[PDB]
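Q: Could you write out the predicted structure for this multi-component system? I'm mainly interested in how the pieces pack against one another.
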Amino acid sequence: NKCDVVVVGGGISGMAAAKLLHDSGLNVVVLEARDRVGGRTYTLRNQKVKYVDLGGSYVGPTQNRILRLAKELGLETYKVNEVERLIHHVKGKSYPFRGPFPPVWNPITYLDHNNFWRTMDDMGREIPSDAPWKAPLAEEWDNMTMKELLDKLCWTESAKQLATLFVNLCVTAETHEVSALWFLWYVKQCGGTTRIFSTTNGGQERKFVGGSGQVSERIMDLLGDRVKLERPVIYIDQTRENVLVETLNHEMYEAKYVISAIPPTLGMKIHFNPPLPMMRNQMITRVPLGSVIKCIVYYKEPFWRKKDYCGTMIIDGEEAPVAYTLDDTKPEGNYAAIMGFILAHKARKLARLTKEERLKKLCELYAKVLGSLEALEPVHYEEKNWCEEQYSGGCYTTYFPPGILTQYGRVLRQPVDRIYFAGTETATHWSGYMEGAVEAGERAAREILHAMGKIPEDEIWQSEPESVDVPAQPITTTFLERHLPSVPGLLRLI
Amino acid sequence: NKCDVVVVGGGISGMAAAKLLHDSGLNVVVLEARDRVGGRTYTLRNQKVKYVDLGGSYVGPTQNRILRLAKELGLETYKVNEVERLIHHVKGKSYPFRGPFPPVWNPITYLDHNNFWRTMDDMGREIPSDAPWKAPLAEEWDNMTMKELLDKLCWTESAKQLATLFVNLCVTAETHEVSALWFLWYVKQCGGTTRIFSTTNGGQERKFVGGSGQVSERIMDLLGDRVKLERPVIYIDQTRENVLVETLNHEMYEAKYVISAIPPTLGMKIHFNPPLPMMRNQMITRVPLGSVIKCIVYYKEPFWRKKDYCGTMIIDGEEAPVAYTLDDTKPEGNYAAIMGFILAHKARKLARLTKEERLKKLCELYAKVLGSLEALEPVHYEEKNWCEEQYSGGCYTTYFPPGILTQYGRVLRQPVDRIYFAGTETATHWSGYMEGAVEAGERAAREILHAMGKIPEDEIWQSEPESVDVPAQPITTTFLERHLPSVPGLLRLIGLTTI
Ligand SMILES: *[C]C1=C([C])[C]=C2C(=[C]1)N([C][C]([O])[C]([O])[C]([O])[C]OP([O])(=O)OP([O])(=O)O[C][C]1O[C](N3[C]=NC4=C3N=[C]N=C4[N])[C]([O])[C]1[O])C1=NC(=O)[N]C(=O)C1=N2/[C]=[C]/[C][N][C]1[C][C]C2=C1[C]=[C][C]=[C]2
Ligand SMILES: *[C]C1=C([C])[C]=C2C(=[C]1)N([C][C]([O])[C]([O])[C]([O])[C]OP([O])(=O)OP([O])(=O)O[C][C]1O[C](N3[C]=NC4=C3N=[C]N=C4[N])[C]([O])[C]1[O])C1=NC(=O)[N]C(=O)C1=N2/[C]=[C]/[C][N][C]1[C][C]C2=C1[C]=[C][C]=[C]2
């Protein structure tokens, strides 16, 4: 019934907000639609896998908030296997390599690839993390899809194929689906192309021992009966002194303030009184989430390591169901496994098949790419298609089609009377990630603390000390990387 | 409580569906979120205006279903004023003209304008009305915005400016917001560029005497207490023998079948058990409605007619708040008025102003365009910003961003167990319009009649006899219009003669 703050959503962001408020001495209630917490994180446990992350999993350097929260809850990380060689598979052939990006030998192709990554970062330096609509060329870049930008930038099919895979992998959407401004912002606010794409020293460096679902689970443990499961929120009424929040099972909650910690578009599932302001009313119809199936194939041994392959595969082309894999073996070296993502249109196309049919296609692909018959003998399989989830809408996160970010972007975290907005989509650093979920939940919690006169305005946004366990190495470039001409640049010189 | 069919939504589509089912002898209930029926149609009545349509208003030749339904309800149409000259206002100057499209004198610009409209229709002929995703180049066209297509097609700024206005006016969205495949489908399924853009012999030919809101109102009168107002649906449960539908005010309805007659994205406001299939789950998050403010400025007399202007203005340029107007004077010649649309980004930009501020900007624009000081002396003003509507989401209709129609289009009207889908967005002829609302509502109703074994399969889709009151003249082209080269076409001819 009555409390200080109702938090709508028991994902990492909602849980992080509720914990901060609880620790500050306020009475909080979390209303969660599902019969579990964690949202876009979900750790499955069974005897065959021990544990496996079927949603969000990876953490890395510069993601200090999620690392701090997890450590406080008694969790530890381990390093994703990147000891041996990575593989770039292109035109039916595997090319092993070391370093974050697959190397290029043809001189013209080299210039084109170098210019592509460089230009993504160059453009990003003009985009404010907390206000991408304030970029000098915001409208020009927002009125273009990533497909148009890539068609302009990439003088080789080689670069365009890799750039396309990069987009698909980052935001689980097609290049023609997404705004160029939004995508460039997205990469920039994760620290740039090297940081986002790297395993060692990047976003995919580590996973949590025992799974990421433990973050939301352990906060639920701390909050006790304050978390209400199977309470989908249906109605928010702000016409009176206290805010009224109603659930599908007909419970009524009364609070001074509300935190909305759900994907922006899932705000549509709530009927508002009074109606939302015009801009938010339309915004929440314009912001879909991507499409992905996360698939984990289990083997008797991590056989790829014997061939000096780490398990990372970057796989070009339409025919391949999975464009990117990582070794998912446990740190102890057992429960050998390969994790792959079926991305964007392929998630939609391949969903028509059976689980067994998808397993077969993945095994035959992996056998090809790894050059190993052992890939054809899986011992177990787990998968999750996030497109089917009513209370997620997709994964990993919300994307912005052309024209939307400039017109509606500023309303994302703008309070509506006594409703404040959390959720990873509202973060300014690693938005889209578990890190962004923590940032946004704590920031939204502090907005309410300020509204209550409990903290000053300059404490709403708070810096985070660097993790001592996962220190960040700086991102470096070489002289030649910085100064070598693009393809059209070289032609000008000629 | 218990009935044969629950219809969710009391707009024209839901009301047409409910009426058909009722007439067939079934027990129907209509659950409507608002304190009124009509949805994206709304006729305001007061002493200053008598009546005025603030939402959907125009009907025309080839829209035979809405015309038949309205006639059966005792309604009549009248012709929108197009006796005098139209105005094209470009680069701060007005150019009066006659005919549906502004004439072009520059031979190069002429070729470019002629090729633009022609090519829109050429491309449209490759797109099946009932399955646009089956077009031979569906993926190529769907992966492009209308902005990209226009940049490719238009060799003059003049053509590109007019083409941009055309898109904004048709679908209340920016050219960079919308799929080229979807937009080309949208125009084709209204009968093409001439039919959609025309007043005389097109979509803007007529309005209903007394307002379009009367269609939904008079059906409510026929259905009596079967229409439940202020019953927003929150929950649909199909796990049991009969379908359970719950409302926000905690009422429960039980039915054999359900018709969803709401904008596709507004399906998000309903919690489903079991969850929707994956494709529909995601589709309903990918399909926004456009942005528009409909504004009506009232004057003592229709003074523009005295200067041989009909009241139609096509107004190019960023500075102009309104890009298109029509005479909204009553057929009796009184309550003189100009209707204008504030479109797409301008609906968002200008919403920041007060009502009085918007009135002032419109009057000063109209004074300039009509060359008339009388435009600065309004007697009344009415407006409606559809962007603010929780139970509409926007107007006129739903648009598809790049990539969506080919991936998700086929699920739009695919039944989900015992839920069938009406609403104008699911129509195949004048989708987006009141006509499409009628087509989709009656089609969805007949899908259920077939499911009940009451009619054969071949009766689900039904042709409509042409109106005797609003006959359709065919769309014609001239020999030169058909065969004159494009700009690049002419350049090829110059290339070959020089080679
Ligand atoms: C799904 C997914 C996947 C598959 C994967 C991934 C992911 C995901 N990611 C993302 C994450 O997870 C996120 O971000 C988070 O989680 C979010 O959080 P938040 O914000 O909190 O949200 P959520 O979860 O959703 O929650 C919400 C809640 O609420 C609820 N609801 C709803 N509605 C409602 C409710 N309640 C009441 N009422 C109502 N009405 C729900 O239910 C929930 O619970 C991620 N992240 C990270 O960090 N990491 C990771 O890993 C991840 N993942 C992914 C990744 C990938 N990566 C890749 C590889 C290579 C590369 C890449 C990228 C880039 C570059 C390279
Ligand atoms: C808004 C608007 C405006 C401003 C204008 C216009 C329009 C609109 N349009 C469109 C129409 O209106 C439509 O289509 C119709 O109406 C639709 O119907 P339906 O489908 O039925 O839908 P609605 O209405 O929306 O209804 C629904 C219902 O439901 C309900 N709900 C929700 N949710 C819910 C519910 N319930 C229960 N529960 C729940 N959850 C709601 O409330 C409702 O009621 C149009 N159309 C026609 O036909 N006409 C006209 O006029 C119109 N408009 C416009 C036009 C324009 N035009 C222009 C001029 C020149 C040109 C153009 C275009 C093109 C070219 C040229």
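A: Regarding packing and overall arrangement: Chain A touches chain B through 47 residues (CB under 8 Å).
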